[model samples]
Target: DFDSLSGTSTTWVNELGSVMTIDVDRKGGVTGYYVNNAPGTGCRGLPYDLSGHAHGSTIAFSVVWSNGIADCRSATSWAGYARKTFGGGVQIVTQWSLAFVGKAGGKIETGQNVFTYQA
Candidate 1:
């Protein structure tokens, strides 16, 4: 069932308690919500719109934090792959790029997170 990323609605979470819930279509199109748990952010502990693609073991998604929130004007994207652990478990390892509210290209950060599969 891990061959293709279609018809599988999976949810993974990071150590920070951020949730990444993805529902993939047959064409590898993805739609979901990313629950941010970052501390002191404008939309911390909020859910944002997520969209991207997933094919085979590869997955990438972007979260628009400025869509429906009043205090957030930033965005983030994660591009990486999924892996099966030695015991046959699953994890989504990704490098994320976050662009903050900036004027003339302010601050951007990049980091990596290993997301464990959850319900």
Candidate 2:
């Protein structure tokens, strides 16, 4: 359950090693930052805002890459569900819709992110 989202902040990492560190409030409001640890994206160690709400075992959040000073301008939204993993941790499986907001970016991209709690 989302109760695993307890504490001030929990760190999560995707299979690709991208860290999506989140803070869960008493009312399930979530605010956090994401660091894309993959390569060739441009920014290094720069974090972006991820704000949303969690209810039941589901969570929703969005990040406007337009707000970044790291040379990317776009927006991405994530809708996902969380579950308890095998080792008493939580995992988040999220599907994202991304807007490619540039002259060459005349389309929308999509992907999924599966996050596991990081100790």
Candidate 3:
């Protein structure tokens, strides 16, 4: 559902096992995901609204590190994080690890991968 009518610079990646697209915007030195129809309507806006349970749909963007390194299967070491809400905005973030299956190629990496999706 994510479509940018404003032509923002967003990177789109296909979901691992799906046709769904994940858009990402790197601005303000904090790379964030490009949410379409946030709050659950589907991807469809600019400076989009990621309100409500829509943010619950957030997923690991990928395996990323501080030095700007990343790969697929990166969220396998996911730990649990607490979701917080402020001014009516809510989000989920991981702190310790990403608990997912490792790649068949025996690849292991670390770092923080920005996670964004419809909750």
Candidate 4:
């Protein structure tokens, strides 16, 4: 049902007691999606765009912040995703891949850390 998909309530909780909240407006669009009381790392109240698709009981959305700050060997962009599971919980996932200039630096990290909450 779409009843649980829209609300200003807790969506998921992780093992370390981290809370994930999704704020939905009247038309059933997400206005704010936060975790542990923060929008994201180095991002708070910043203008962003969300675009994705839903198939059956699952929905995936990506958030791209507009705080473009270029740096050398530093963070210049941030992006994240929220994937709703078949049942009720949602998964907030992200990954970062770097192809340094002239193929000089690199890093890799990947995993799905699920959380629990009432949808």
Best by lDDT: 1
Clashing pairs in 2: none
Tens digit of lDDT per residue, candidate 2, span 11-47? 8888768888899898889999988776665444678
Residue-by-residue lDDT tens digits, candidate 4, 1-119: 33345544446555434443555544545544433223333444334434333323344444443435322332222134556679755665433332233355554333344445565
Question: Global CA lDDT of candidate 2, please?
Answer: 0.79
Tell me how far the alpha carbon of residue 25 in candidate 1 is from the true structure, in angstroms, after superposition: 0.4
Using TM-score as the measure, the top candidate is: 1
Q: What's model 3's lDDT at 68?
A: 28
**Model 2 stretches with alpha carbons more than 4 Å out:** 3-7
Sorted on lDDT, best first, the list reads 1, 2, 4, 3
lDDT of 3 by residue, 14-72 (tens): 23211123233322111333322323322233332121111223333322222223222
Full-model lDDT, candidate 3: 0.30
- Candidate 3 vs 4: which has more TM-score: 4
> How many residue pairs clash in all the candidates, one count each?
0, 0, 21, 1
Which residue pairs show backbone clashes in model 4?
A: 13-116
lDDT of model 1 at position 75: 82
Tens digits of per-residue lDDT for model 1, 49-80: 89998777887889878655554667889988
Q: Which ten residues in a row have the lowest lDDT in candidate 4?
A: 70-79
**Stretches of model 1 off by over 4 angstroms after superposition:** 1-3, 103-105
